[PDB]
Design a binder for this molecule. Structure first.
Ligand SMILES: O=C(O)CCC(=O)C(=O)O
Ligand SMILES: [Co+2]
Length: 199
């Protein structure tokens, strides 16, 4: 893809149904909820987290917390399937020492999007981002360091894993409004798992 970035198409295919079963298990303790941005806007993407640290929104800005702001209980632990798939994808991408402590689980309903942003809430930029696509296909935008920087448009389908780090660690990215459709394992949505070293 780019410098320090690669797309491992259909990498998570074999682990997919186990990952989805574990998403439901995580969601049973920490439900999927549409977070409100520090500006006051409800996001179209429904989110939840697992592992030690979880990505959330607050009035001060975006941050990581070991506590779920909705349940007021800690986020569920990182499932074995998640940890194993992430490790294998990381090593295959050229980052063998990747040790995630956070997994952001994103649910995209038809028409849901995630506008162009940078993953800049993590202090250690040496650690990559491992992103797993499950279910309905979506067009992933991948740009550069600036907002006006040219965007590459890639389709991400069920089982595709994108890993970006190194030079591409702070590159702008996002998902375009999800096209309506169906998938045998996720029914009417697209699930995405983003593994990060947050601490
Ligand atoms: O859904 C995707 O493929 C990207 C998710 C993402 O960019 C994020 O969670 O920060
Ligand atoms: Co992101």
């Amino acid at each position: 893809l780019a410098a320090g970035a690669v797309i491992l198409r259909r990498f998570a295919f074999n682990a997919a149904e186990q990952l989805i079963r574990d998403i439901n298990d995580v969601a049973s303790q920490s439900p999927f909820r549409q977070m409100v941005t520090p500006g006051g806007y409800t996001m179209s993407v429904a989110m939840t987290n697992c592992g030690h640290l979880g990505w959330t929104t607050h009035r001060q800005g975006y941050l990581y917390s070991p506590i779920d702001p909705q349940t007021n209980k800690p986020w569920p632990a990182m499932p074995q399937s998640f940890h194993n798939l992430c490790q294998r994808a990381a090593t295959a991408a050229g980052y063998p020492d990747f040790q995630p402590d956070a997994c952001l689980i994103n649910r995209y309903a038809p028409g849901a999007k995630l506008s162009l942003h940078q993953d800049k809430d993590e202090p250690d930029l040496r650690a990559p981002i491992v992103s797993v696509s499950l279910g309905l296909p979506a067009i992933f935008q991948f740009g550069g360091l600036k907002r006006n920087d040219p965007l590459k448009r890639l389709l991400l389908e069920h089982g595709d894993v994108v890993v970006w780090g190194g030079e591409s660690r702070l590159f702008y990215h996002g998902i375009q409004p999800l096209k309506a459709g169906f998938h045998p394992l996720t029914i009417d949505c697209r699930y995405n798992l983003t593994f990060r070293q947050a601490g």
